[PDB]
């Protein structure tokens, strides 16, 4: 097979060849077996919301033209999209909610493996929420922050504070005028599921306004998750590590942390260092913890744990034969891992009650027992390492250098070395003088339909040459790190002269004798909220709303419902937002026109649907430059 | 066309002939245009939970055999079912939540059109919840009940009290042992949406246990909705009225209330009597309010408002040409009504912010302005009546007599005339002696796939001849009322000798000089909770759990996600539960075996999937008789 048609990652290509000769089916094989995919589903023109279905509508031609109950294409498309947004928001609800409970347990003395690690962030969040701190114990402040987090999930006397306190007042005012401020996170999720059920909401604009509001519930969960993880585990600062399959070590116990919620995998990291001598007794050099997906991003950002792989290529880590354990929480885990494990020897371990996989070993993680749980898990990994003594492994000797840890606090601190009391001003100065053309956030997944990483790297290369400041999260950050976009040694090759000058000036003032990396890694998918914090801080410093800023987003290879929700809130907060795969909307021209055009008149943002990455880069540059022109800037 | 293949209701048949000659497309025409329906959707073997889809699995044959991410048929089927349960629960969340807010507003002086109408029910609910009443103002008790209702939507120090306080302790204990008690109504809905999103829960048993727990969140919303509606609007007592299209009157202003939440349509009823002379000034005899679906059931149960039609046949009320207005809240409204209105003259009016239909007139109902809103709405109806002066109409002269209003309180009161201080004992006595073989609850919708009412009437006839006490809600009650099953004049024809003797003894002791009707109408779909209250009271009186009682349920023509949720909680509380249409589960034998067999070992209940109604009646009788045998009773 030509493996480069599947993935642009050479380590992935090498493992695809191994999987092929060993007869191990991969995600790419399961995709091929699915073709041709259903065109009703692809276009959004299918409904299964009641037992009179399934209903479908022919995109073109003759009947069927309308659902059995009378639901039009507009209604069917908008209802399906709304449920996808609610599903995305629900994952972020679960992630943030878990962290809120963990913080509450910690400060109540119920979970001594957890603690307040970032006291400053705690007090800053309390202040933003209106919680008094003067003369209060940190534990009581944290109890109040956890209570406020849990309160945002349901209706109360205030709207969702993890929306209204994180966006500029002018933006909150626009959203409120259109009825878009969430009343409660789980409240909005449930209202979406109700209104999209049979015989309820049946007006495309009304449905889509509901979707915008639920996407802000997703934003609140993202921002709440980042806030609470930073309190518990530390706010990221710049770190240096490596990425790709070559971070695996044949002579070590290789343990991947995979999923999203690092609540236990932050603990796995710390415990793994304590069990080094137990690993050495078993014949290993040590325990080598590596990351997959956003749990991997979390521990990369906070501890420099190397990233093994991401998203669509996750099975390939197992194909090496050296992955002794894969420790799972939830979200973005291909359930194929449980069956591949039988072929590769890997011990796959689930840990969360609501996310089990038939055939995997389940360990019932509890914060109250986190260290004990981590030791049980790592001992299974050590046992597995011992079982592969003498077996050959094939780890591609392929890895890149990765500078990461660019939380918004870290970015502001780095800029403060150029201007101590007005840190955003050097960035704004360079936007104004054209050294920085604008900002682009790359976000979201890989998707088996797109050769892995091709859109992220093609678009990023064009933007960087045109002096765009590129930030990235999730598996977009994964794609860019695995292709060298987080290695400062590649600044000369990748970056336009203006951007290079700025990255160099910031780097030299931070004592690096070298530039910042070409792309700034801002963390996990919930950490898209960090990009919101940066952009809102810029808006406040400039006295304008986000829909006037030369800032865009690109979910260039989107897959998960999470990514749909994130793209939708990016639009809702005012950003031009590219999506590089087709969401199921093309079966309705009216819905497509709302999402790509008339929503501009509501929020100032809009979707740019473009599957060709060179064309998408041109459209993103045009959007940036239109914003520059609106501010009276050359472009 | 042979109209009896579409509906067994002769009034519906007559209007189908009119629709045909006038060129007005109906739900049956849109169904025909949809055939053949997609077999992947029919069997449950389709997934659109991420942008790598749509994925499908061939029920039999070759590839595709597995989803792109590795999701098996078991996982795909269970995830789709779970989302349907969550959607059903969300509708009941929205309905109950709305009523909780209405009660709070009323007792805070913010909505003087609303009030505490049933003070006794208020105090009984407060006592069941643990709320003190001694020495407290009714308004403060009601404020506390409304607060407790709203608290059950999110996590707190107690589980959902509208589950744990309404089922016997032994049942709560079984459910708790299996992890099935909901933590919060909207909490469970959101956890379902998370766990069913890509790369999360992927074990069929774990997924389905989550679904059982979310179905109890639906039960809580149902019971909360009935409780609060009874406080606000009165607990039903026996009433006499009529049903079917002949309740429309050519010389009156005909106004249908349609949807679920009678929050405003209870007001419409009261206001309509006040505007009689305005209607007379416009040339009408008066305002004739009639019911459709469960909002219709609500006002039938409390005020004897005649029921025009139900569910699948709702368009036919408009085809008469005499329906001047259709006043909509949410749920079960075919959106085709908005376009048919242009052909029939009817004014279709929406009233709830989250349920609009393109082309309908929207009036923004607010409790604070309910009387004003009702007058605006009824004045549109009067105007419409005037526009049809001189136009012929075709109202089928077909209607039945309906005795209804059998709340659980009403049933207990009726039985108390035979035994004042042990009212359930005469019912139990007659179960023991075989005069009553068991109880069957008919629930749920009609479905265009089934000739309308055919399953409800075929099954009911067989059960009644075998001395089963039949109770009914929703459009199952609608089907039975429209075919004479709520007219005591039909007891001799329909009922076995034992059941007739019991209905007669109760009727004669209630001063009727005649029996209770063949079937007891227990109300709307949320009022399935009343059947739960009756069955739980019987369980408590007998000292056994619900899974030992000779009680079954039949969603004989199910359609809405609501009906899936209700059927699932019927199973979860311990009942054999028939469903007369195919839910999308047959693509997975393991899931089917859980839902129809091994769940017995968890909750004592189980689904009986049977599309042939004669066979379904035999299977329901077998289930009843097995329960009788387990209690040592003849059968
Ligand atoms: S909700 Fe309408 S369009 Fe969807 S399956 Fe049911 S009848 Fe078909
Ligand atoms: S979740 Fe899995 S089965 Fe469903 S659409 Fe995505 S890849 Fe296909
Ligand atoms: S007809 Fe294929 S997605 Fe439903
Ligand atoms: S393939 Fe028809 S329901 Fe998806």
Strand partners, A289: A255
Burial of A124 (0-12, 13-18, 19+ CB in 10 A): middle
DSSP string, B471-498: EEEHHHHHHHHHTTTT-GGGHHHHS-HH
Residues in CB range of B542: below 8 A, 6 or more apart: B428, B549
User: Residue positions of B in the annotated binding site for [4Fe-4S] cluster?
Assistant: 38, 46-47, 50, 55, 69
Burial of A36 (0-12, 13-18, 19+ CB in 10 A): exposed
- Is B46 close to A42, i.e. CB distance below 8 A? no
Cα B503 to Cα B519: distance, rounded to the nearest angstrom? 10
Cα B621 to Cα B438: distance, rounded to the nearest angstrom? 9
- Is A54 close to B64, i.e. CB distance below 8 A? no
- Give whole-number Cα distances, B346 to A399, A449, B26, B507, B544, in Å: 69, 49, 16, 41, 53
Cα atoms found within 13 Å of the Cα of residue A418, Cβ hemisphere only: 19
Resolution of the coordinates, Å: 1.2
The residues in B 180-199 lying below 8 A from A, measured between CB atoms, are: 184-187, 189-199
Hey, is B421 helix, strand or coil? coil
Beta pairing class for B576-579 and B606-609: parallel
CA angle B568, B570, B572 (to 5 degrees): 70
**Comparing C-alpha atoms, which of A294, A307, A301, A290 is closest to residue A252?**
A290
At A325, give phi and psi (nearest 5°).
-150, 150
Cα A311 to Cα A345: distance, rounded to the nearest angstrom? 21
Task: State whether residue A30 sits within 8 Å of chain B by CB.
Answer: yes
- Give whole-number Cα distances, B100 to A358, B95, B144, B259, in Å: 41, 9, 11, 18
Strand partners, A253: A287
**Comparing C-alpha atoms, which of A453, A517, A441 is closest to residue A486?**
A517
The residues in B 143-182 lying below 8 A from A, measured between CB atoms, are: 150, 153-155, 179
Cα B78 to Cα A125: distance, rounded to the nearest angstrom? 40
CA angle A117, A118, A122 (to 5 degrees): 120
| Ligand closest to the CA atom of residue A335 | 2
Cβ atoms of A336 and A320 closer than 8 Å: no
User: Which alpha helices (DSSP H) does B234-365 contain, by range?
Assistant: 265-274, 276-281, 293-303, 315-319, 337-344
Hey, is B383 helix, strand or coil? helix
Structure tokens at A209: 């306004």
Candidates A50, A54, A339; nearest CB to B560: A50
Cβ-based neighbour number of residue A268 at 10 Å: 27
Which of A24, A68, A208, A343 to probe the B interface (max B CBs under 10 A)?
A68
What is the separation, in whole angstroms, between the first and last Cα of chain B? 45
Tokens 């849109």 belong to residue: B30
Cα B530 to Cα B522: distance, rounded to the nearest angstrom? 7
Residues in CB range of B148: below 8 A, 6 or more apart: B129, B131, B161
Torsion angle defined by CA atoms of residues B115, B116, B117 and B119, in that order, rounded to the nearest 10 degrees: -170
Task: State whether residue A137 sits within 8 Å of chain B by CB.
Answer: no
At A240, give phi and psi (nearest 5°).
-125, 130
- Is B189 close to A193, i.e. CB distance below 8 A? yes
DSSP string, A275-294: THHHHHHTT-S-EEEEEEHH
- Give whole-number Cα distances, A593 to A43, A76, A179, A331, B120, in Å: 14, 15, 21, 31, 55
- Give whole-number Cα distances, A492 to A485, A486, A512, B14, B548, in Å: 11, 13, 16, 80, 77
Residue closest via CA to ligand 1's atom 5 equals A53
Cα A195 to Cα B601: distance, rounded to the nearest angstrom? 35
Beta pairing class for B46-47 and A46-47: unpaired
B38 CB near ligand 4 (under 6 Å): yes
Distance in Å, alpha carbon of A359 to nearest chain B alpha carbon: 9
Sheet with A323-328, strands from edge to edge, namely A361-362, A347-350, A323-328, A253-259, A287-292, A307-309, A239-243, A400-404
- Is A93 close to B41, i.e. CB distance below 8 A? no
Cα atoms found within 13 Å of the Cα of residue A561, Cβ hemisphere only: 29
Cα A169 to Cα A175: distance, rounded to the nearest angstrom? 10
- Is B87 close to A203, i.e. CB distance below 8 A? no
Cα A555 to Cα B429: distance, rounded to the nearest angstrom? 68
Residues in CB range of A347: below 8 A, 6 or more apart: A324, A325, A326, A341, A361, A380, A381, A383, A384
**Comparing C-alpha atoms, which of B171, B402, B200 is closest to residue B309?**
B402
Cα atoms found within 13 Å of the Cα of residue A505, Cβ hemisphere only: 16
- Is A560 close to B199, i.e. CB distance below 8 A? yes
- Nearest chain A residue (CA) to B329: A200
- Is A356 close to B448, i.e. CB distance below 8 A? no
**Comparing C-alpha atoms, which of B67, B69, B66, B591 is closest to residue A335?**
B69
User: Residue positions of B in the annotated binding site for [Ni-4Fe-5S] cluster?
Assistant: 260, 294, 332, 445, 475, 525
**Residues of A with CB below 8 A from B41's CB?**
46, 48, 53-54
- Is A559 close to B198, i.e. CB distance below 8 A? yes
**Comparing C-alpha atoms, which of A384, A242, A246, A386 is closest to residue A327?**
A384
CA torsion through residues B473, B479, B481, B485, sign: negative
Q: Identify each DSSP E strand in B409-527 by its residue range.
A: 439-442, 469-473, 519-523
**CA A251 to mean position of chain CA atoms:** 32
Q: Identify each DSSP E strand in B286-410 by its residue range.
A: 287-292, 307-309, 323-328, 347-350, 361-362, 400-404
A69 CB near ligand 1 (under 6 Å): yes
**Residues of B with CB below 8 A from A335's CB?**
69-72, 75, 199, 202
Residue closest via CA to ligand 1's atom 2 equals A69
At A359, give phi and psi (nearest 5°).
95, -10
Cβ-based neighbour number of residue A138 at 10 Å: 16
Structure tokens at A95: 């992630």
Beta pairing class for B239-243 and A469-473: unpaired
Structure tokens at A466: 């045109």
- Give whole-number Cα distances, B1 to B20, B220, B450, in Å: 9, 44, 16
Cα B200 to Cα B79: distance, rounded to the nearest angstrom? 10
- Nearest chain B residue (CA) to A448: B52
Cβ-based neighbour number of residue B550 at 10 Å: 25
Specify the ligand 2 atom closest to the Cα of B54: 5
The residues in B 299-318 lying below 8 A from A, measured between CB atoms, are: none
DSSP string, A482-533: HTTTT-GGGHHHHS-HHHHHHHHHHHHHTT-SSPPPSEEEEESSTTHHHHHH
Residues in CB range of B622: below 8 A, 6 or more apart: none
Strand partners, B362: B350
Cα A68 to Cα A265: distance, rounded to the nearest angstrom? 48
Burial of A129 (0-12, 13-18, 19+ CB in 10 A): middle
Structure tokens at B211: 């679904």
Cβ atoms of B581 and A53 closer than 8 Å: no
Cβ-based neighbour number of residue A342 at 10 Å: 10
Distance B38 CA to ligand 2 centre (A): 18
Contacts across the A-B interface (CB distance below 8 Å): 328
Hey, is B243 helix, strand or coil? strand
For A390: left if phi > 0, alpha if psi spans -120 to 50, otherwise beta; the answer is: left
B68 CB near ligand 3 (under 6 Å): no
Distance B76 CA to ligand 2 centre (A): 8
Cβ atoms of A7 and A453 closer than 8 Å: yes
What technique solved it? X-ray
For B321: left if phi > 0, alpha if psi spans -120 to 50, otherwise beta; the answer is: left
CA torsion through residues B13, B18, B21, B22, sign: negative
The domain limits of chain B are 62-236, 237-405, 408-635
Candidates A54, A58, A64, A67: which one to mutate for ligand 3, based on the most atoms within 8 Å of Cβ?
Answer: A54
**Residues of B with CB below 8 A from A525's CB?**
none
Cα B431 to Cα B454: distance, rounded to the nearest angstrom? 28
Cβ atoms of B350 and B328 closer than 8 Å: yes
Cβ atoms of A470 and A459 closer than 8 Å: no
- Taking each helix axis from N to C end, the angle separating B185-195 and A185-195, rounded to the nearest 10 degrees, works out to 80
- Is B51 close to A354, i.e. CB distance below 8 A? no
Distance B46 CA to ligand 4 centre (A): 5
The residues in A 408-447 lying below 8 A from B, measured between CB atoms, are: 447
Cβ-based neighbour number of residue B511 at 10 Å: 8
Candidates B38, B70, B186; nearest CB to A189: B186
Cβ atoms of B275 and B289 closer than 8 Å: no
**Comparing C-alpha atoms, which of B205, B46, B195 is closest to residue B591?**
B205
Cα A417 to Cα A436: distance, rounded to the nearest angstrom? 18
DSSP character at residue A367: G
Candidates B89, B330, B358; nearest CB to A203: B358
Cα B353 to Cα B349: distance, rounded to the nearest angstrom? 12
Burial of A622 (0-12, 13-18, 19+ CB in 10 A): middle
Residues in CB range of A393: below 8 A, 6 or more apart: A250, A320, A321, A322
Tokens 């019971």 belong to residue: B223
- Give whole-number Cα distances, A141 to A144, A232, A235, B160, in Å: 5, 13, 18, 28
- Nearest chain A residue (CA) to B35: A64
Residues in CB range of A149: below 8 A, 6 or more apart: A96, A97, A99, A100, A103, A162, A224, A227, A228
Pocket lining for ligand 2, CB < 6 angstroms: B 47-50, 52-53, 55, 67-69, 71, 198
Task: State whether residue B42 sits within 8 Å of chain A by CB.
Answer: yes
Cα B86 to Cα B260: distance, rounded to the nearest angstrom? 18
Cβ atoms of A51 and B447 closer than 8 Å: yes
Residue closest via CA to ligand 2's atom 6 equals B50
CA angle B102, B475, B192 (to 5 degrees): 65
- B595 upstream amide cis, omega within 30 of 0: no
């Amino acid at each position: 097979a030509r493996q480069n048609l599947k993935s642009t990652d050479r380590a992935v290509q090498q493992m695809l060849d191994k999987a092929k000769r060993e007869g191990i089916q991969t995600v790419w094989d399961r995709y091929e077996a699915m073709k041709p995919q259903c065109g009703f589903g692809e276009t959004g023109l299918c409904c299964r919301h009641c037992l009179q279905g399934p209903c479908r509508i022919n995109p073109f031609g003759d009947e069927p033209k309308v659902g059995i109950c009378g639901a039009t294409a507009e209604v069917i498309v908008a209802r399906g999209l709304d449920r996808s947004i609610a599903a995305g928001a629900a994952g972020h609800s679960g992630h943030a909610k878990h962290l809120a409970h963990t913080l509450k347990k910690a400060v109540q003395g119920k979970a001594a493996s957890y603690m307040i690690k970032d006291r400053t962030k705690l007090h800053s969040i309390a202040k933003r929420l209106g919680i008094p701190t003067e003369g209060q114990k940190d534990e009581d402040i944290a109890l109040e922050v956890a209570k406020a987090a849990l309160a945002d999930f349901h209706e109360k006397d205030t709207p969702v504070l993890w929306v209204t306190t994180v966006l500029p007042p002018s933006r909150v005012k626009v959203l409120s005028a259109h009825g878009l401020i969430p009343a409660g996170i789980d409240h909005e999720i449930a209202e979406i599921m109700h209104r999209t059920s049979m015989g309820c909401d049946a007006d495309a604009q009304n449905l889509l306004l509901g979707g915008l509001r639920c996407s802000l519930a997703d934003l609140a969960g993202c921002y709440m998750g980042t806030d609470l993880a930073d309190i518990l585990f530390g706010t990221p600062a710049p770190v240096v590590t490596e990425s790709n399959l070559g971070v695996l070590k044949a002579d070590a116990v290789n343990v991947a942390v995979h999923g999203h919620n690092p609540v236990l995998s932050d603990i796995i990291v710390s415990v793994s260092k304590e069990m080094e001598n137990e690993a050495r007794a078993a014949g290993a050099t040590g325990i080598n913890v590596v990351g997959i997906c956003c749990t991997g991003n979390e521990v990369l950002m906070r501890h420099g744990i190397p990233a093994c792989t991401h998203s669509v290529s996750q099975e390939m880590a197992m194909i090496t034969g050296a992955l002794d354990a894969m420790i799972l929480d939830y979200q973005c885990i291909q359930p194929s891992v449980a069956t591949i494990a039988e072929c590769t020897g890997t011990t796959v371990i689930t840990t969360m009650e609501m996310s089990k996989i038939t055939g995997a070993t389940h360990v019932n993680f509890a914060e109250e027992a986190a260290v004990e749980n981590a030791k049980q898990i790592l001992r299974l990994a050590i046992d597995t390492f011992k079982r592969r003594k003498g077996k050959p492994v094939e780890i591609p000797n392929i890895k890149t250098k990765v500078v990461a840890g660019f939380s918004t606090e870290a970015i502001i601190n780095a800029l403060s070395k150029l201007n101590a009391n007005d840190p955003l001003k050097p960035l704004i100065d360079n936007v104004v003088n054209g050294n920085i053309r604008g900002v682009c956030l790359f976000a979201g997944c890989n998707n088996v339909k797109v050769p892995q990483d091709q859109n992220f790297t093609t678009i990023a290369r064009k933007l960087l040459k045109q002096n765009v400041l590129v930030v990235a999260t999730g598996c977009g950050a994964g794609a860019l790190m695995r292709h060298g976009f987080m290695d400062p040694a590649n600044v000369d090759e990748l970056c336009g002269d203006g951007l290079k000058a700025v990255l160099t000036a910031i780097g030299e003032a931070n004592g690096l004798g070298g530039p910042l990396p070409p792309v700034l890694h801002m963390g996990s998918c919930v950490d898209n909220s960090r990009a919101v914090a940066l952009v809102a801080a810029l808006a406040n410093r400039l006295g304008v709303d986000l829909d006037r800023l030369p800032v865009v987003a690109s979910a260039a290879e989107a897959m998960h419902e999470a990514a749909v929700a994130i793209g939708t809130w990016a639009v809702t907060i005012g950003l031009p937002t590219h999506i590089g795969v087709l969401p199921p909307i093309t079966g309705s021209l009216p819905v497509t026109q709302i999402l790509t055009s008339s929503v501009k008149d509501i929020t100032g943002g809009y979707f740019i649907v473009e599957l060709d990455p060179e064309t998408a880069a041109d459209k993103l540059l045009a959007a940036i430059n239109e914003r520059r022109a609106g501010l009276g800037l050359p472009w």
